[PDB]
Scaffold this active site. Sequence first.
Site, PDB file in Angstrom:
ATOM      1  N   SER B 155       0.855  -1.186   0.000  1.00 24.55           N
ATOM      2  CA  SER B 155       0.000   0.000   0.000  1.00 24.55           C
ATOM      3  C   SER B 155       0.886   1.229   0.000  1.00 24.55           C
ATOM      4  O   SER B 155       2.027   1.160   0.445  1.00 24.55           O
ATOM      5  CB  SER B 155      -0.837   0.016   1.286  1.00 24.55           C
ATOM      6  OG  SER B 155      -1.588   1.205   1.415  1.00 24.55           O
ATOM      7  N   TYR B 168      -2.380  -1.379  10.347  1.00 25.60           N
ATOM      8  CA  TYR B 168      -2.157  -1.473   8.897  1.00 25.60           C
ATOM      9  C   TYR B 168      -0.826  -0.882   8.445  1.00 25.60           C
ATOM     10  O   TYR B 168      -0.148  -1.498   7.632  1.00 25.60           O
ATOM     11  CB  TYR B 168      -3.320  -0.793   8.164  1.00 25.60           C
ATOM     12  CG  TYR B 168      -3.395  -1.093   6.690  1.00 25.60           C
ATOM     13  CD1 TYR B 168      -4.025  -2.244   6.227  1.00 25.60           C
ATOM     14  CD2 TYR B 168      -2.974  -0.157   5.752  1.00 25.60           C
ATOM     15  CE1 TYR B 168      -4.185  -2.483   4.862  1.00 25.60           C
ATOM     16  CE2 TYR B 168      -3.119  -0.388   4.388  1.00 25.60           C
ATOM     17  CZ  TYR B 168      -3.741  -1.541   3.951  1.00 25.60           C
ATOM     18  OH  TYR B 168      -3.876  -1.742   2.607  1.00 25.60           O
TER      19      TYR B 168
END
Lengths: 265, 265, 265, 265
Positions: B155, B168
Amino acid sequence: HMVNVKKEFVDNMFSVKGKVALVTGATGALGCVLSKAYGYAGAKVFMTGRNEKKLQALEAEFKAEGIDCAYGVADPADEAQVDAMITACVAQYGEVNILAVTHGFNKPQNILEQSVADWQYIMDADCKSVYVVCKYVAQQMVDQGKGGKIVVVTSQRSKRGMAGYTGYCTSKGGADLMVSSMACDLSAKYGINVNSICPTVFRSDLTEWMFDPESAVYQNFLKREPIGRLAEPEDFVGYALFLSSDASNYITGANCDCSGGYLTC
Amino acid sequence: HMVNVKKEFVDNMFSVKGKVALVTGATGALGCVLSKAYGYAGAKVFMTGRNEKKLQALEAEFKAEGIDCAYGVADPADEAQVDAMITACVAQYGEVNILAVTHGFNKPQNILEQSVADWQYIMDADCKSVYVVCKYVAQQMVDQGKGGKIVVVTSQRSKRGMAGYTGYCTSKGGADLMVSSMACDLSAKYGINVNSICPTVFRSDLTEWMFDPESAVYQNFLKREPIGRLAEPEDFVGYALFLSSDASNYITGANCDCSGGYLTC
Amino acid sequence: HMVNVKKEFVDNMFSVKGKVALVTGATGALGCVLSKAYGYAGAKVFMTGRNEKKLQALEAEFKAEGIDCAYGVADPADEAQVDAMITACVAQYGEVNILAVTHGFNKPQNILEQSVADWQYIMDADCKSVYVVCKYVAQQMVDQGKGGKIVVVTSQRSKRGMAGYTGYCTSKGGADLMVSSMACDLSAKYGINVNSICPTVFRSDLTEWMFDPESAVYQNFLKREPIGRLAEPEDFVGYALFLSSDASNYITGANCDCSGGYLTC
Amino acid sequence: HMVNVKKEFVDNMFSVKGKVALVTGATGALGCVLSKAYGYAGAKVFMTGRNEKKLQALEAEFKAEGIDCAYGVADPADEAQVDAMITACVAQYGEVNILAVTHGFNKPQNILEQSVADWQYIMDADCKSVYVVCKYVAQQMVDQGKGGKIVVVTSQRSKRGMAGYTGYCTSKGGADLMVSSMACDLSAKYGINVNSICPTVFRSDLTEWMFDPESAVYQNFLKREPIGRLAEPEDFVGYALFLSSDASNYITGANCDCSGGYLTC
Ligand SMILES: NC(=O)C1=CN([C@@H]2O[C@H](COP(=O)(O)OP(=O)(O)OC[C@H]3O[C@@H](n4cnc5c(N)ncnc54)[C@H](OP(=O)(O)O)[C@@H]3O)[C@@H](O)[C@H]2O)C=CC1
Ligand SMILES: NC(=O)C1=CN([C@@H]2O[C@H](COP(=O)(O)OP(=O)(O)OC[C@H]3O[C@@H](n4cnc5c(N)ncnc54)[C@H](OP(=O)(O)O)[C@@H]3O)[C@@H](O)[C@H]2O)C=CC1
Ligand SMILES: NC(=O)C1=CN([C@@H]2O[C@H](COP(=O)(O)OP(=O)(O)OC[C@H]3O[C@@H](n4cnc5c(N)ncnc54)[C@H](OP(=O)(O)O)[C@@H]3O)[C@@H](O)[C@H]2O)C=CC1
Ligand SMILES: NC(=O)C1=CN([C@@H]2O[C@H](COP(=O)(O)OP(=O)(O)OC[C@H]3O[C@@H](n4cnc5c(N)ncnc54)[C@H](OP(=O)(O)O)[C@@H]3O)[C@@H](O)[C@H]2O)C=CC1
C-alpha cells in the site's frame, strides 16, 4: 457481475506500435538501446543528440532492419536548438507521443577542488537540459491534445549522495523532484504522465579498472547489488517501454527503482 | 558493432504465457482483476483464498472465456493450509512460476481504543500471512531450480502513516522491508525476483459516503492525486504483469509506486 | 518590531530537568547510556527490562552519583507486566513525561531456514512490544493531560533491507510507520510527540570478528559510513534528549537519521 | 564497569557558546530568528544578506541585548562577494565554526508558462548560492583545521513535488543531495558535519488569503499536519542548534524532518 478487466486492454497494454518516440542522448549506451527497442516494438523513432556521426550510424543500422527512424542534431541544454529539433520531429512524423530523456554528463570532483563553474557545467548539461527538453516536448503534447508519456533517466544517485558527486547528485536529486512537480503541473489537466527511472551503474562502464586490486569500485557495487550482477542497458528497456505505454496510465510523478536492490539494502 | 538489444527479447519480454501464476486474495477487488489479467495474458492461474463460493464463481467465469485456471482454499496465515494449497497447485500444474500476494485486512482504530489483540489480528492477517505465503512459495521455486517472480501488494500506507492505522501501517511498512530483505535472501542465489507495489485507494471503496458533505475522505485523496482520479484495480494490472515477466529481470527488492503521485506530492 | 524568539525559551529548550523518563531495555548497550544521560541531565529515571540483576546494578551506580532513579521488572511484550510496571513508575514519581524505547532482539536467518515461529519471535520481541509499551504509556500521558515525549529506537534497517533480516527489517520497518501513525493519533489532540531514531551499528558489537580476514562485516559498514567511524551509544544521547525536550516541540512522526550517512550514500 | 557516558559531556553537549555562527539570509523570517537564537545561546553571530538596512536593524537590536554580532553584505550567488564576506567575518572573529544557510527565493509558475530563464533564476538564487556559500565556508573550515558544522535549510519540498514548483523542488531536492554528497566529501577527513533541515510552511506566510473561502491552501496544509498547527520560525531553533553542537557529532549527510508530520502522513 463480470470481473472489471478487459481482454483487449490486457492484450495491448504494453504496445508502443505507431507511437512517435523522441529519444535524447540517443547516441549513448542507454539511448541507442532504448531507441532500437522502441523501433523493434514498432514505434517511429526520432533520435537526438549533439553527435551527428553517431546519429547517422544508428539511423543506417535501424533502417536496414525496417525501423522507421530519423534524427535531429541539438544540444539539449540549448532551448533554440531543442525547439527547432522538435519542429523537425513534428514535420517528419506529425506529433510526439513519447519522450525518453537519456543524455547526461558527469565529472566527479570533491567540493574543495571543484570550481563553481565546473559544478554549473554539470548542472547545465544534466539538469537544465532536462527542464528544457521536458518543457518544450510537454508544450508540444499540450498543443496536440492527446496526452503523452515522458520518461526521464535520472540515477540511483538521485536518492543517495556520493563522494565527488556534489554536481551529479544535485542534478539527479533535483531532476527526480522536477519530474514529480511536472506530473503535478501536467498529468490531471493534459493526460501527460511524467516519471523517472533510477538506474544503478552499467557493467561496461567499470571494465577499465575491474582488474586493478587497488580499486574497490567494482566490488563496492556488487556487495550492494541484491540482483547479483551489474546492469546492461537492455535491463532497463522493459521499464522504459512499460512507462511509455497504456499499461502505466495511472503511474505519474514516480521515481522508479532500477537499482537491482542497491536502493533498498 | 550492432546495438546490444535483441528483437526477440523486445517482442517477448512482457510475456507470462504458459507460466503458472498463483494469486492470493483472488476473490478480492484487486485479486480477481489480477487473476483474470494473468489468464487473459495466457498464464495458468491458480487462485487462492478462504472464500470457496467466490473462488468457484471466478473459476466458472474464467473457464467460459478459455482461461486455464483452478483454485485452492486456504487461510494464508495458516502454514499447514498454505503448504497443502501449494501441493494442490503443483498436482494441478506441476510448478509455481509467479506469485501475486493480494489478500489483506484492515480495521482502523486509534491506538488508545485499539487493544493489543486487535492490532495483532491485523498483523497476523496482513503481515504474518505474507511471510507464510512467500516462504512456502519461495521454497517451492528453490526446489524447482528455475527462478521465479514474487509480487507483493502492500500500500502507499507502507511509506506514509495515517490516523487509526497503527495496525495497517506497521503491517504494510514491515512488508515493504520484508520484500527488500527477501530479495537479499533469494535473488542472486536462486533467480527469484521479489518486489512490492504500493497502491493508492480504489474509487469503488470511497463511493458509499462520497455524497456525505461532512466527510473529507473523498476530497483529501483527490487534492493528493496528481493523476487526477482515484484508481481502479485494472490500473495495476500493467505493473503486476511487468514485475511478473522477463521485462523486469533486473528489478528486485523494489517497493513500486502505484500511488498516482500521492507519494511524491 | 522585535525578532520573534525568546531568550528564556532558547536558554531552557533542551532541558529534561525534573521530568520523569521511563527507559525500556535500560540494561542494554544504548538503554544504560540513555538512562544515565537522562539522570545526568536532571530527569527522574525509571528503568525497565527483564534482567533484574542488571537493573539493580544500574540503580546502585546511578544513586551513588546522586541520580534519582528506580526500576520495574517487565517483559515489554507482555501487556499485564507493562501495565503493572507503569503503575509502579506512577506510584514512585507521580507521572511519566518521557518514554525512550530501546529494547530489542535479532537472530538473522535466511527466509528458507527461518521457521514462521522464529520470524514471529522477532516480531513479538521487537515490534509487538513497541505497540504495547507505546499504547500503555500514551494512555498514561493522555490521563495526565500534560502531553509528553515518546522516542522509539528503531534502526537504519527500518529503511534498508538486509540478507537474513526478514524478521528484524519487518519489525523495524513496521515500527517506523507505527511511530508516524501514533503521531497522527496523538500529537494534535494530546500534545504527545512520537518520533523514532534510526541508528547504524555500534563499534563494540563488531569487535569479535573484527580481526577475521574472511569477514567483510566491519569493512562493509565503513565504506558506507561518511562520518568515518562506527558509533558508540553516547553518539545518540544528544538526539534522544533533543527529541525528549521543548527544543523539538514541533517535531512529530519523524524517523530520524542516526546512521552517520549510511542512509544517504 | 561504569556506564560509557560522561556527565561533563551531557551537561555541555548542546553548547554553541563562544562559537562563530555565520548565518545567510539573516534578514529573513527564519534567518533573523536563528541569528538571534545563536546570539542568545552565546555564539558570536556574523549575519549576511543583500539587505544592508535590515542587517543594520538586527545588529542594533541584538547589541542592545548584549549579543556579540556583526554583518557583511553579499549576494550568496556571487562568489567574489561571498569570499569577501567570509574574509570580513574572519577579520572580525578570526574563524567560522558554524554555518546556517537560510536564504532562498521562490516564484511558483506552471512549467508551460515558466521560461527557462525564470527556472534558472530560482536555481541560481536557491541552489547555486548554496554550493557557493558551502564551498567557500568549507574551505575556510578546512584551512582552520578544527572541523565545523554546516546546517542547510532546504524544505519538505526537497522530498515532495508540487504544482508550480519545478524551479523550487528541483533546487531543494538537489540541495538535499548536495548536502549528503558534501558530507561524503568532508566529514571523515575534516570533521565538518553537513546536514539539512526540511521545514513545512510558516503560519505568517499563509495569513493574507487565510480568510478567502475560495482558497484551500491554509486547509490543505492542516489536513497534512499531524502536529496540529502551522510552524513558527522559533520551532526550528532547537533543531538548528542541535545540528550546530557536539550533541550531533555523529550526525552527517542527514536531511532532517522539520515538517510536523507532513512528510510521514
Ligand atoms: N552508465 C551508467 O553507469 C549510469 C548512467 N546514469 C545516467 O543515465 C543516463 C544514460 O547513461 P549512459 O547511456 O551510460 O550515458 P553516456 O555516458 O553514454 O552519455 C549519454 C549521452 O549524453 C550526451 N552527452 C554527453 N555529455 C553531454 C553534455 N555535456 N551535454 C549534453 N549531453 C551530453 C552524449 O550524446 P551526444 O554527444 O550525441 O549529445 C552521450 O552519448 C545519463 O544521464 C547518465 O548520467 C545513471 C546511472 C548509472
Ligand atoms: N482497496 C484499496 O483501496 C486499497 C487496498 N490496499 C491493499 O491491497 C490489497 C488488495 O486490496 P483489495 O483487493 O481492495 O482488498 P479486499 O478488501 O477486496 O480483500 C482482499 C481479500 O483478502 C482476503 N481477506 C480478508 N480478510 C482477511 C483476513 N482476515 N485474513 C486473510 N485474508 C483476508 C479476502 O479473501 P478471502 O475471504 O477469499 O480469503 C479478500 O477478498 C489488500 O492487502 C489491501 O489492504 C492497498 C491500498 C488501497
Ligand atoms: N547495537 C547495534 O549495533 C544496533 C542496535 N539497534 C537496535 O537498537 C536497540 C538498542 O540496541 P542495543 O542497546 O545494542 O541492544 P541490546 O543487544 O544491548 O539489547 C537491548 C535490551 O533488550 C532486551 N531484550 C533482549 N532480548 C529481548 C527480547 N527477546 N524481548 C524483549 N527485550 C529483549 C535486553 O534487556 P532485558 O534482558 O533487561 O529485557 C537488552 O539488554 C535495539 O532495538 C536494537 O535492535 C539498531 C541499530 C544497530
Ligand atoms: N517560509 C516558509 O514557509 C518556508 C520556507 N522555506 C525555505 O526556508 C528558507 C527560509 O525561509 P524564510 O525565512 O521564510 O524566507 P524569506 O522569504 O524570509 O527569505 C530569506 C532571505 O533570502 C534572501 N533572498 C531573497 N531573495 C533572494 C535571491 N533572489 N537571492 C538570494 N537571496 C535571496 C532575503 O535576504 P536578503 O534580501 O538580505 O538577501 C530574504 O530575507 C528559504 O530558503 C525558504 O525557501 C522552506 C519551507 C517553508
